[PDB]
């Protein structure tokens, strides 16, 4: 009567504990999974942080090698113009020497001949002056 009413209510209690205990276990297991994920999220954030810095510095290296190729291409072209310049220099020396060789070609063995003829005649005139001094 009341006796069976009490037994019904006692059961309803047992059932409500069973529900609440199951729920309690869900909750604290769910709290586990959330803390493990918080830690994982933290690890990932840190990897991304480090990796963004590696990216920044590798971008810097890349800008620097791009600049060096620009500058080294400048060097190559300058050396090319140096070579072209030096080759003109050699051509000019070689022209100068052609002219210097033609200058040398101008030579005269005929002027020594007049030299000796004139010399003897001056001293023949000296002979004549000595004989006219004698009187």
């Amino acid at each position: 009567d009341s006796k069976q009413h009490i037994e019904v209510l006692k059961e309803s209690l047992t059932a409500k504990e069973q529900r609440a205990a199951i729920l309690q276990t869900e909750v604290d297991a769910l709290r586990l999974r959330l803390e493990e994920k918080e830690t994982m999220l933290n690890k990932k954030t840190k990897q991304i942080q480090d990796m963004a810095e590696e990216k920044g510095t590798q971008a810097g290296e890349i800008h620097d090698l791009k600049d060096m190729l620009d500058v080294k291409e400048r060097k190559v072209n300058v050396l090319q113009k140096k070579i072209e310049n030096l080759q003109e220099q050699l051509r000019d020396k070689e022209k100068q020497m052609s002219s210097l060789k033609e200058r040398v070609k101008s030579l005269q063995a005929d002027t020594t001949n007049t030299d000796t003829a004139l010399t003897t005649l001056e001293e023949a005139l000296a002979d004549k002056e000595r004989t006219i001094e004698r009187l």
Partner: protein, 56 residues
């Protein structure tokens, strides 16, 4: 007619003096270029060796 050969030599010597001056310009430009190359090389080495001392 040797004076002609002389004015030809003078003309070519003017030209070669000009080429020597152009040459010394270009050499100044290579000295510039090499200074930028050294600057770039040292900037690269410093970034690397900063990361190297950081990782220690």
């Amino acid at each position: 007619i040797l004076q002609d050969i002389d004015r030809e030599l003078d003309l070519v010597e003017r030209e070669s003096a000009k080429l020597r001056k152009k040459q010394a310009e270009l050499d100044e430009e290579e000295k510039e270029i090499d200074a930028k190359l050294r600057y770039l090389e040292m900037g690269i080495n410093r970034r690397k060796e900063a990361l190297l001392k950081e990782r220690e």
